[PDB]
Amino acid sequence: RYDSRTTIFSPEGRLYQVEYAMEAIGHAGTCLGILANDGVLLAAERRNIHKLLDEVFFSEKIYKLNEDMACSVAGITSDANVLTNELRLIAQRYLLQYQEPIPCEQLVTALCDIKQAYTQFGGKRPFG
Amino acid sequence: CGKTMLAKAVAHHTTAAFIRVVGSEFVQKYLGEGPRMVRDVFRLAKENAPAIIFIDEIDAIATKRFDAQTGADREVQRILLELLNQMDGFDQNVNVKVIMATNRADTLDPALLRPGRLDRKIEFPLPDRRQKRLIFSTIT
Amino acid sequence: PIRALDEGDIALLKTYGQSTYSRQIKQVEDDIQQLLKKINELTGIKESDTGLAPPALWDLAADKQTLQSEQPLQVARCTKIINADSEDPKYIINVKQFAKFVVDLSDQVAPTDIEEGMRVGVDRNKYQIHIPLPPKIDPTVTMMQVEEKPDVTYSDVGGCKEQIEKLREVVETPLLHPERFVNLGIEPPKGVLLFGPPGTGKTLCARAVANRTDACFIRVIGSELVQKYVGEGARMVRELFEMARTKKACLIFFDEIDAIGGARFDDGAGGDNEVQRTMLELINQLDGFDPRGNIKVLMATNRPDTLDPALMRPGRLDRKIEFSLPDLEGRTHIFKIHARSMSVERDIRFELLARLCPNSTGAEIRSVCTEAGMFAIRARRKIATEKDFLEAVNKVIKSYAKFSATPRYMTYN
Amino acid sequence: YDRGVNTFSPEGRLFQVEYAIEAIKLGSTAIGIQTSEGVCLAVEKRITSPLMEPSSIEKIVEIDAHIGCAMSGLIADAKTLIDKARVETQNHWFTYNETMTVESVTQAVSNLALQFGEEDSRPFGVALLFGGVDEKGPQLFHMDPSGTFVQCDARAIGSASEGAQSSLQEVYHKSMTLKEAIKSSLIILKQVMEEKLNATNIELATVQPGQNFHMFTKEELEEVIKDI
Amino acid sequence: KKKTKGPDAASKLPLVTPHTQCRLKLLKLERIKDYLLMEEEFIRNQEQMKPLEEKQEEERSKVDDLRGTPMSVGTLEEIIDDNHAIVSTSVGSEHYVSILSFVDKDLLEPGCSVLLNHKVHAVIGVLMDDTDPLVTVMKVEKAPQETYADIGGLDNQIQEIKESVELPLTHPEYYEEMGIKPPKGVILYGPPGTGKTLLAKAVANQTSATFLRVVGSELIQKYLGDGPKLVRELFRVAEEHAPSIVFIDEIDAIGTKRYDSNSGGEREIQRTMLELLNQLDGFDSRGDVKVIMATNRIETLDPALIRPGRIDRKIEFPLPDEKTKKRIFQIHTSRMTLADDVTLDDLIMAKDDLSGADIKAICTEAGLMALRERRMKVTNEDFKKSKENVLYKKQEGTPEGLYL
Amino acid sequence: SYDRAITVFSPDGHLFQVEYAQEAVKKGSTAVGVRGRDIVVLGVEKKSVAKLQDERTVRKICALDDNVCMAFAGLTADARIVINRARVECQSHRLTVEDPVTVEYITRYIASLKQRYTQSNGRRPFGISALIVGFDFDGTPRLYQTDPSGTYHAWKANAIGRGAKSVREFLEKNYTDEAIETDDLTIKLVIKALLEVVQSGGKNIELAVMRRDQSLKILNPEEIEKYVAEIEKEKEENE
Amino acid sequence: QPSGNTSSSALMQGQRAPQKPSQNLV
Amino acid sequence: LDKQIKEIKEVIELPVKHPELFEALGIAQPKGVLLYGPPGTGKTLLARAVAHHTDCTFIRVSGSELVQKFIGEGARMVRELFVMAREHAPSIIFMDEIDSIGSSRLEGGSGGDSEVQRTMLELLNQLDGFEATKNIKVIMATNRIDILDSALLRPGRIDRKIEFPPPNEEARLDILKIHSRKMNLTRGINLRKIAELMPGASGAEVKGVCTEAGMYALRERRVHVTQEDFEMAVAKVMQKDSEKNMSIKKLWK
Ligand SMILES: Nc1ncnc2c1ncn2[C@@H]1O[C@H](COP(=O)(O)OP(=O)(O)OP(=O)(O)O)[C@@H](O)[C@H]1O
Ligand SMILES: Nc1ncnc2c1ncn2[C@@H]1O[C@H](COP(=O)(O)OP(=O)(O)OP(=O)(O)O)[C@@H](O)[C@H]1O
Ligand SMILES: Nc1ncnc2c1ncn2[C@@H]1O[C@H](COP(=O)(O)OP(=O)(O)O)[C@@H](O)[C@H]1O
Ligand SMILES: Nc1ncnc2c1ncn2[C@@H]1O[C@H](COP(=O)(O)OP(=O)(O)O)[C@@H](O)[C@H]1O
Ligand SMILES: [Mg+2]
Ligand SMILES: [Mg+2]
Ligand SMILES: [Mg+2]
Ligand SMILES: [Mg+2]
C-alpha cells in the first residue's frame, strides 16, 4: 500500500504516517490553557497514580523553559525530553546573541521548523 | 490442574442426557458446515430431556479482536456468531446447560462473557501445601 | 415529549378537506382492476400443435394399417456387443445403462454378418439378437458443423501480415500443394494455437479461413461438451472425431479451451472430476498411432497462462501464433477498411487520426468510426467531417479512465 | 523485473534507458535541415491557453552567437543541459581564445549525460538538435538520452517523428537552396498539424556563415506563410 | 414470419392529467369503465349464444382413441428408416419404435420433442414448443408505471440511451443512408442510489418490442450443466421473438476477472460467465437483440466483457449538482399540500452530498414529523428537523486543515 | 502499481510520484491575481475563520521583499520553508550586487530549489504552487506562476486552488482585450472573479494591491462592501 | 491458503425399473 | 426505551392500520429499520415484544441459516422466502446478526468470498429492485454498524437507524425495579444507592446483580435479601484487569 516511510504520497490520499501521528496523541494526558487579563493559566492532568511512587519530581508535565515561558507536553517521553532541552538551548543562544529575552514568538517557529524537517528526509519517524 | 476430571465427575452422577463435543470438531472443509453442526447439536439436546452440553476446547474460536478482511476468517467469525445466536437468541429453550473449559480467559470475546449467557466464571489455580497434602494422601 | 394519535384524531384526519369526490373516485379504480382480472381469466389459449396431416394423407390407412401396426411390432430396445464368443454361440451384451447379459441370436438371422462391436436390436423379454443397426450418428454433432460460408475475405484483415502467412502455411498449403514438404523432406504440422489480448483479431481470422476453405468445417461449442449425466462428454468427443474421420478434408475449430480445462487438481470430490475425464478422452484421441491425416485442429484462447502444459507437447500442438497490437501502418489500414462504406468529406487524411490512438486494437477503431457517424447524426447533416472524428477520438480512446486532465501536458512541452 | 537501472536482462537489454527513449514520444515535433548556404530549423508551438504569454514558452535557444539548439521531451531537464553547454563554450573560449566546433560541444554535453548511474539517479529524458556554422561550414547533430552522437542531413524529432520522416525522405537532395528548404519544411509542418496553420504556432531559425547573427524571424512569417 | 412483436404492455390509458379532484378525471374514468364493461358483455354474449356444434367428423374421436390417453413426451434422436425411427425416453433408454401415419412427416428434425404412446411406444405426434418455466417467467407483460416525466433531469444520459435503444426502431432511415450499425450494448455505472434502475423502468414503460428482465445471481444452478444451457435458451427465446431487449442487473455476481483456482463450483461460475460472453459476441451472428447491463462498481469486471464490440456505450451516473436538487425537490413534493413559508433554497444549498433516494426520504420524514403534531400543512422547521435529526451517517477525513 | 518510487519510469514514460503530488495542491483555498496599467492586485478567499482564535498568525500572503509579493496554495509548512529561503536569497543578491532583485530572478531561483528535491530518493517533493507579482524592472509590472514539478510561466490572469477551472472559464471570457485602466475597474474585475465563492459569505474576500510606486497596500473591511454595493447596483441594470 | 470453498453436484442416474409387457400377438 | 418504542411502533404498525392516511399528505410508506448498539442492551427484547403484539405473520430468518453447501440454492432460498411472505399478505421479517451476510463486498480471486456475496446481492435486489413489493416489513439487528456494506444502508432499503445507548442512572434504577419483582426484599434497602454504584453498566448485568444476590441468600438457606448481599453481588459482577507491567503504562506521558 502506501503506509511505508513518510516520503511517498498516496494517489488521492495525504501523507498517512502523519495521519497516524495525529491520531496517536489522542489518548495521551489532558492539558489545557486559558488567557486572562494580567495573566494566563495552565491545567494538567496526572495519570497513573500509585502509592509506592516516590513523587520526588518538582513537576511532571510542566517545565519552566526559558525565563518567562512554560510549556506542557503530551505524547512519548523520549521525544519530550529532547524537545525541551532543545528549546532551552535555542532560547539561551538567542539571549547570547542580542542581550535581550526571546520575543515569545520566533522560537516556536524555530522548533516547528525542526519538527517539519523530519517529515522531509527519509529514514526517520516524525515526532509524536 | 484437573478440570476434565470434574467434567467426568459430573457425567457420572447425572440423571440428565450428556453430550461431550470437542471444539475443533466444528472446523470443516466445505462452506456452511460448521454452523450446521452447531445448529444440529443444539436441536438434538433440545428434543430430548433436560440435557448437558460439554465443549472441550474453545481457544480456537473465542475472540474477534479485529475485523475479518481475508476469506476464511469470516468463516470463523460466523461460527462464533452462530454459537452466540443459538445460545441466547430469539427462540429460548429451557432445561439445557452449557459447560466451557479453556486456558486463561483474558482474551475471550466479551460477547460471550456478559451475564445471561456465561454467568459463572471459575478458577482452577495451582495447588498449595494443603492441596498437595490431600492429593498425596488420596492417591497413595 | 411526544404523544400517540388517538381514535378521535384519526377520525377527524379523514374528514377535513376530503373534497366531495374522494371515495367516489377510488371505488372506480378498484372495480376497474377487478374486471381486468376477470376479463383476462376468461381468455386462455388454443394449440393445434400435434402435427396431424390433412385427412387425405391419413387416407383409410388409419384403420387398415395403423390399426394393424400397434399389435404386430415390438419395441426392440437397442444395445451394443463387446465380446463375441466364436464357435461358441454365447454372446455378451451391455445396455450401457443396464448390466451385461449373456444372450444369443434369433431364429431367422444368419450368424455370419454379426461382426462384434456394433449396435443391435434386442427383444425386451428374452434379450435375443434380432437385427443390426448402423453405428450411431450423434444428433447434436450433425448440426455441430457449420455447413455455411461467412462472407469475410482475406482482403478485410489489415495489419496482420505475418500471422496470416503462418496460418496459411499451416492450413491451406498442405491441403493443396502437398509436394514441397516431401520434396525437401519435412512433415507438415497439425496443430496451431492462437493467443493475444482480447480484441486483437483472432476469431475474425478464423472466420476468414472458413470462407476459402474448400473443405469441411466444424464449429465447436466449448460449453456444450460438459453434461449432467456421467460418462457423456467423452462419448461426444469420440463421436466427433470418428465422424470427422468418415469424410475427407475436414477442419476442426475450438474456442476457449480454458472453458473445458487447463489445469488438473486433486480432490474435487463429487461433481468436478467428470470434466477431467472428458479432457483426457480428447488428448489420447488427438494422437497415438495411425497418423490422423488431412485433419487439422485449431485452438484459440485469450488466457494462455492457465492451460495444462500437457497440451504443449510436440505432436499435439505444433505451432503457436501470437497476435499483437498494430503499430502504425496497421492503424492507417484499419481506418481505411472501416471507413469506406459511409458518407465522408472527401479531403480528410487518416494518418493524423492514426497518431492520436497509440495503444488501441481493431475494436476501438471500429467504434470510433461509428461514433463519428453518430455525432454527424445529432446535428442535421448528411456528410460527416474532420471535426466529427476529432471529437469522437476524445470521446472514446482517451476519455475512458483519464488522469490529470486539468494539469494536462503542463510539464511535457 | 525492470525496477532497476542497474540490472540486465536474460537477453541482455537494459530496461530503463528504453523507457526514457520512448518518453520523448509525447513532446512536440521539430524539424531541421542542413544546406550548403546554412542551417534551417522549425518547430511547432502547441499553445495551451489564449491567456498564456506566447514568449514565455520557447523551443529554440541560442547558446552562442554561432550555435543554436532545438528541444523536445521533458521541460525541466532541458535547462540543466543548456546552461552546461553555455558554460563549457565560454570556458573553452577563455582558455584557447577561439570558438570550438559544434562537435566538441555535443561531446561535452553527452559526456555529462552518461552519468545516470556511472558516478559512485534517473537518466535525462530529452532529445536535442544542434545546429551551427563551424570552420567546415554548416553543421547539424542529433542527441538522444543514451548519449549517442550522430550527424544528420535532415531530421525530425518528437511525436510524429516517423510520420514526417517518410515524407521528408522523398524530397531532400544535396543540390538544395535554403529558400526552398524553408518552404518544404513549412509544407511538411502544415500536413502533420491538427490545427489550421497560422503565424502563431511556429517559430523559425536560420544561421548562415556570413550572417551568423539574426537567429529568428519575427512577424514576417505572415508573408512566408501566405505564398504557400 | 417469426413469432412477431409479441408486445408486452397493459398500459390502458394514463390520462388523469387533472391530477386533482376535478370532474374531468371522473368523466374520463367513467368512459374507461363503461368501455370495459361493454367488452365484457360482448364476450359473454359471444360465449352464450353459440348454437352450432358437431366437431368430430366421425373420425376425430377415432384418431383420439387410437393414440393412448396418457401420451408421454420423448426425444427423437435418429430416423434410420421410414416408419421405423428411433427415439429415446428420459432415462436414456432408446427404443427402435415405428412411425404411424396422421403425423405430418415434414417438420420432424433430430433433437425435437415428440409425443409417444405407452403400450406399444410408437411415435404419434410432435410437440410444438418446449420452454421451461424458468424462461417464460422472466418475461414481463405489465409495464411499470413510471415514465420520463418523473426523472429529475439527466438530459445527457436520456438522450444517449434514446439514441441507443429507441431511435433505431421508429425512424430507421438515417442509419442506412450513413452506413452504420447502431450500438447494441450499454453499461450503466456509478455510486449507489442514483437512478440506474429508473431508466430501465422508464424505457420498459414506453416501447414496442419484447422486454426480458434478469437479475444477476440467478443464472446459476447446481447440476453442473444447467447454467450455460439456460443462458442459451434465454437468448434463443429472445431472438425468435420480436426486436426484444434484455436487462441484466447486478452483474458483478457473474463476471469477475476469470482467474485460476481450486474449487469446482467457482469453475462452474467461470464456465457460465464465459458461455454468456460467447453468446453475446462469438461466431457468425448475433441477431436483433439489445442488452442493458447495470452495476454499481465497474473496475472489478473481466476485461473481456467490457471491450468495445460487445459493450459499445458506457454511461456514468454522477452525484447531483445544485441545479438538479431543485428539480428533484419540485418533483417529489408536487402532490404534497404545503405552506407559504417554506423555501427549498436553504435545504438544497446547505448540504453538498446527497442523492435522489436521500431526497425522497427527507420529504417523507418531514411530512411525517408534521403529522406528528396533528397538522396537514408542512413548515420550514419540520424540514429542518427532517434533514438534521436523521438521514445522515458520517465519515471523516483531512483532519484540521493541513492545507491553507 | 508501477509507482512507489521517485526515480522509476512507467512503461509509457511517466513520473507518477510527481503527478501524485500535483493534485495535492488542489486541496487548498483558491487565490487569483492580475496585473494592470498601473496597479497589480492579488486576491484570496476561503478564509473561513474559526471565530475562537487570533488571525494575525494565519497569514497567507507574504512579501518576499519591499516590492514583490507571493501567494500560495497546498499545504502550509512547506510554504513557510520556501518563504524563508526566498527572502534570504533575495537579500543576499542585493548584497552581492547593488541592484534590486528583478521579479524574474527570484522566481527562477524558487523553481531551481523546487527542482532539486526531485532527483534523489529520501526527499519528499514540495507540495505547493506559488504566484509571484512584481514590477521592479523600470516601473513595469509582471506576474509568474510556478509548479511543484519546477517549471515557471508568464501569464496575465491566473487562478489556483480548489476549483480554479471555473474561475478560468469565467476569466477567458470576462477579461477584456481593452487594456484595463481605471484601477477601480480592475478591482471590480477581481471582486467579480472571486464572486464565485462556493458559499459567498460576502466577508470572505481579501485583496492586496501594488501601484508601481509604494510598498504593499492592504484593503480593509469597509471598501469591500461598498464595492459589493456598486456591483449590485450595476447588476440591477438587467432590463 | 485456508479453505472455505464449495462445489456442485452430479445427479443419481439409477431410476429405471422393469414393467410387464402387454403385447397382443396372436 | 420509551422513544425507541414510539418510533418503532410508528414505522411498523401505523402504515398497516391506516394506509389512507398516507394516501393523504401525499407521501410514501417507510419500510426499513435498523437497530444497533453495544452488546446486551435490549435489541432482541424489542423483536420478541413486537412478535407478541404483532397481529401479523412473523417470519424469522436469523443468523447464518441462508449459507448452504452447493452453489446457487443459497440464493433461491431468499426468493422462496419472499414469495412465501407474499402469500400471507401482511408480514414482518426479522433478520438477526446480519453482519454475517453482507459485511462488505471484497475483491475477486483466491481471497475473500463470492457465494455469500451472490446471496447478499439477491436479497438486496429483492426489497428495492425492479418490482415493487407492498405490505412487507423488515427488521435488522447488529453490532459494529460501521462495517456494514454501503449498498444496504441507503435510504431506499433502510429508513430509520436507531441506537440503543447504555442506560443512564434513571434507566438503571427502573430496570432494577423490573427485575426485582418476585424477590422478597427485607426493608431499608435503598435501590437508588445500588443503582448509582454501577457506572456504565451494560444493562444485561442488572439481572446478574439480582440473581447473584439471590444465590448468596440461597447458599445460607434463607429467604431474606439484605443490602450487603446486593453490594457483594455488585463487587462480584464488576470485574476488570490492568497492565501490571507498569512499563507499558509509563512510556506514554
Ligand atoms: N486487424 C483488424 N482488421 C479488421 N478488423 C479488426 C482487426 N482487429 C480487430 N478487428 C475488429 O475486431 C472486432 C472483433 O474482433 P474479434 O472478434 O476477432 O476478437 P477476438 O480477439 O476474437 O476477441 P475475443 O477473444 O474476446 O473473442 C471486429 O469488428 C473486427 O472488425
Ligand atoms: N434523478 C432522479 N429523479 C427522480 N427520482 C430519483 C432520481 N435519482 C434517484 N431517484 C430516486 O431513487 C430511487 C431509484 O433507485 P435507483 O435507481 O437510484 O437505485 P440503484 O442505483 O439501482 O441502487 P442500488 O445500488 O441500491 O440497486 C427512487 O426512489 C427514485 O425516486
Ligand atoms: N485432585 C486430584 N485428584 C486426583 N487426581 C488429580 C487431581 N488433580 C489432578 N489430577 C490428575 O491430573 C490429571 C489432570 O486431569 P485433566 O482434567 O485431564 O487435566 P486438565 O485439567 O488439563 O484437563 C488427571 O489425570 C488426574 O489424574
Ligand atoms: N432495558 C432493559 N430492560 C429490561 N431487560 C433488559 C434490558 N436490557 C437488557 N435486558 C436483559 O438482557 C437480556 C437480553 O439482552 P439482549 O436484548 O438479548 O441483548 P442483545 O439482543 O443485544 O444480545 C434479557 O434477559 C433482558 O432481561
Ligand atoms: Mg483439559
Ligand atoms: Mg473471438
Ligand atoms: Mg438497482
Ligand atoms: Mg442480541
Coordinates of N, CA and C in Angstrom, one line a residue, chain B residues 30-33 35-36 39 64-65 67-72 74 78 81-82 85 88-92 106 109-111 114-116 119-121, chain H residues 39-40 44 47-48 51 58 60 62-65 67-69 94 96-97 99-100 103-104 106 111-112 115-116 204-205 208 212 215 219 236 241:
Chain B
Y30 N -16.0 -27.9 3.7 CA -17.0 -27.2 2.9 C -17.6 -26.0 3.5
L31 N -18.2 -25.2 2.7 CA -18.8 -23.9 3.2 C -20.1 -24.2 3.9
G32 N -20.3 -23.6 5.1 CA -21.5 -23.7 5.8 C -21.7 -24.9 6.7
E33 N -20.7 -25.7 6.8 CA -20.9 -27.0 7.6 C -20.9 -26.7 9.1
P35 N -21.5 -24.1 11.2 CA -22.8 -23.7 11.7 C -23.9 -24.7 11.7
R36 N -23.9 -25.5 10.6 CA -25.0 -26.5 10.5 C -24.8 -27.5 11.7
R39 N -26.0 -25.9 14.9 CA -27.5 -26.0 15.0 C -28.0 -27.3 15.3
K64 N -12.6 -12.0 18.6 CA -12.5 -11.3 17.4 C -11.3 -10.4 17.3
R65 N -11.2 -9.4 18.2 CA -10.1 -8.5 18.4 C -9.8 -7.7 17.1
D67 N -11.6 -7.0 12.7 CA -12.5 -7.4 11.6 C -11.8 -8.3 10.6
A68 N -12.6 -9.2 10.0 CA -12.0 -10.2 9.1 C -12.0 -9.6 7.7
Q69 N -10.7 -9.4 7.2 CA -10.6 -8.8 5.8 C -10.4 -9.9 4.8
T70 N -9.7 -11.0 5.1 CA -9.5 -12.0 4.1 C -10.6 -13.0 4.1
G71 N -10.6 -13.9 3.2 CA -11.5 -15.0 3.2 C -11.1 -16.0 4.3
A72 N -12.1 -16.9 4.7 CA -11.9 -17.9 5.7 C -11.6 -17.4 7.1
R74 N -13.8 -14.9 7.9 CA -15.2 -14.7 8.1 C -15.9 -16.0 8.5
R78 N -18.2 -16.2 11.7 CA -19.6 -16.7 11.5 C -19.9 -17.8 12.4
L81 N -20.6 -16.3 15.8 CA -21.9 -15.6 15.8 C -23.0 -16.6 15.9
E82 N -22.9 -17.7 15.2 CA -23.9 -18.7 15.3 C -24.0 -19.3 16.7
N85 N -25.8 -16.7 18.8 CA -27.2 -16.6 18.5 C -28.0 -17.8 19.0
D88 N -28.4 -17.8 23.2 CA -29.3 -16.8 23.8 C -29.9 -15.9 22.7
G89 N -30.9 -16.5 21.9 CA -31.4 -15.8 20.8 C -32.9 -15.6 20.8
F90 N -33.5 -15.6 19.6 CA -35.0 -15.4 19.6 C -35.7 -16.5 20.3
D91 N -35.3 -17.8 19.9 CA -36.1 -18.9 20.4 C -35.4 -19.4 21.7
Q92 N -36.0 -19.1 22.8 CA -35.5 -19.5 24.1 C -35.8 -21.0 24.3
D106 N -8.4 -14.1 29.5 CA -8.3 -12.7 29.3 C -8.7 -12.3 27.9
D109 N -13.8 -13.1 23.8 CA -14.7 -12.1 23.2 C -15.8 -11.7 24.2
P110 N -15.9 -10.4 24.6 CA -16.9 -10.1 25.6 C -18.3 -10.3 25.2
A111 N -18.6 -10.7 24.0 CA -20.0 -11.1 23.6 C -20.3 -12.3 24.4
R114 N -20.9 -11.7 28.9 CA -21.9 -10.9 29.6 C -22.8 -11.9 30.3
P115 N -23.3 -11.6 31.5 CA -24.2 -12.5 32.2 C -25.5 -12.7 31.4
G116 N -26.2 -13.7 31.7 CA -27.3 -14.2 30.9 C -26.8 -15.1 29.8
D119 N -22.9 -17.0 33.0 CA -22.9 -16.4 34.3 C -21.7 -16.6 35.1
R120 N -21.3 -17.9 35.3 CA -20.3 -18.2 36.3 C -18.9 -18.3 35.7
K121 N -17.9 -17.7 36.3 CA -16.5 -17.7 35.9 C -15.7 -18.3 37.0
Chain H
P39 N -23.3 -4.7 23.1 CA -23.9 -6.0 23.4 C -24.7 -5.9 24.7
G40 N -25.8 -6.6 24.8 CA -26.6 -6.7 26.0 C -27.3 -5.4 26.4
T44 N -32.9 -7.6 21.2 CA -33.8 -8.7 20.9 C -35.1 -8.7 21.8
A47 N -37.6 -7.2 19.5 CA -38.1 -8.2 18.5 C -39.1 -9.1 19.1
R48 N -38.8 -9.6 20.3 CA -39.8 -10.5 20.9 C -41.1 -9.8 21.2
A51 N -43.2 -9.3 18.4 CA -43.9 -10.6 18.0 C -45.1 -10.8 18.8
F58 N -45.2 -13.4 11.6 CA -43.9 -13.0 11.9 C -42.9 -14.1 11.5
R60 N -38.8 -15.3 10.6 CA -37.6 -15.3 11.4 C -36.3 -15.7 10.9
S62 N -32.8 -16.0 10.8 CA -31.8 -15.5 11.7 C -30.5 -16.2 11.5
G63 N -29.5 -15.5 12.0 CA -28.1 -16.0 12.0 C -27.6 -16.3 10.6
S64 N -27.0 -17.5 10.5 CA -26.4 -17.9 9.2 C -27.1 -19.2 8.6
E65 N -28.4 -19.1 8.6 CA -29.2 -20.2 8.0 C -29.2 -20.2 6.5
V67 N -26.7 -19.7 4.4 CA -25.4 -20.1 3.7 C -25.4 -21.6 3.5
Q68 N -25.5 -22.1 2.3 CA -25.7 -23.5 2.0 C -24.4 -24.1 1.3
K69 N -24.5 -25.4 1.1 CA -23.4 -26.2 0.5 C -23.2 -26.0 -0.9
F94 N -37.8 -10.6 10.3 CA -36.8 -10.2 11.3 C -35.5 -10.9 11.1
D96 N -31.3 -11.2 11.9 CA -30.6 -11.1 13.2 C -29.1 -11.4 12.9
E97 N -28.3 -10.7 13.6 CA -26.8 -10.8 13.5 C -26.5 -10.7 12.0
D99 N -24.7 -8.9 10.2 CA -23.3 -8.8 9.6 C -22.7 -10.1 9.4
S100 N -23.3 -11.2 9.5 CA -22.7 -12.4 9.0 C -22.8 -12.5 7.5
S103 N -21.2 -8.2 5.1 CA -20.3 -7.3 5.8 C -19.7 -6.2 4.9
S104 N -19.1 -6.6 3.8 CA -18.6 -5.7 2.7 C -18.2 -6.5 1.6
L106 N -15.9 -7.8 -1.1 CA -14.5 -7.9 -1.3 C -14.1 -8.1 -2.7
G111 N -9.3 -15.0 -2.7 CA -9.3 -14.3 -1.4 C -10.7 -13.8 -1.3
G112 N -11.1 -13.5 0.0 CA -12.4 -13.0 0.2 C -13.4 -14.2 -0.1
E115 N -19.7 -16.6 -2.8 CA -21.1 -17.2 -2.7 C -21.9 -16.3 -1.8
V116 N -21.4 -15.9 -0.6 CA -22.2 -15.1 0.3 C -22.5 -13.8 -0.4
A204 N -27.6 -5.7 30.7 CA -27.9 -7.1 31.0 C -27.4 -7.7 32.3
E205 N -26.5 -6.9 32.9 CA -25.9 -7.3 34.1 C -26.6 -6.8 35.3
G208 N -27.8 -9.8 36.3 CA -26.8 -10.6 37.0 C -26.7 -10.2 38.5
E212 N -27.4 -12.9 41.4 CA -26.3 -13.2 42.3 C -26.6 -12.9 43.8
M215 N -28.6 -15.9 44.9 CA -27.8 -17.1 45.2 C -27.1 -17.0 46.5
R219 N -27.5 -19.9 49.4 CA -26.5 -20.7 49.9 C -26.5 -20.9 51.4
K236 N -18.9 -8.6 42.8 CA -18.6 -9.9 42.1 C -18.8 -9.7 40.6
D241 N -9.3 -6.0 34.7 CA -7.8 -6.1 35.0 C -7.1 -5.1 34.2

